[PDB]
Amino acid sequence: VTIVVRGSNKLVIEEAERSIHDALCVIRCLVKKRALIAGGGAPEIELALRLTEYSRTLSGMESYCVRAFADAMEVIP
C-alpha cells in the first residue's frame, strides 16, 4: 500500500512521516512479539531482581557474573 500526506510547511509533513515510521516500527514489534510490557525501567528492575535470585542457585564464576549483569540493568531506571 502507499500513504499520501499533505501539510503546510515541510516540517509539518516531515514529522508526519517520521511519526508513521515509529508507529509502523512499534506495530512491527507487536507482530513479531504479540505482547506488551511496562515502561519506566520496570523491566530492568524485575530483570535485576530475579537474576540476583537466579545467581544464588548457580555455581562457579557464573554467580558473580550474573549478579553483575543484574546490577547493570539498574542504570536505566
Add this chain to the structure above:
Amino acid sequence: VIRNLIRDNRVVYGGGAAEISCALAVSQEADKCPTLEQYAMRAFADALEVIPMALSENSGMNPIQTM
C-alpha cells in the same frame, strides 16, 4: 575459647560457614528494607564473604570459585 564455651555452650561451625550463611540471610532480608539502607545491607553480605574468600586465597585456591 574455653571461657566462651563455658559461658555459652552454643557454638557455630567455623571455616567460613557462618559468614556464608549470614550473607544469605542478610541478602534475603535486604529486599524487605524499603529505604537507602538496602544498598548497605547487600554490601554487608558481600563484605561477610571476604573472610571465607580470604581463606581460599591463602590456601592457594581460586577464591571466587570456592566461595
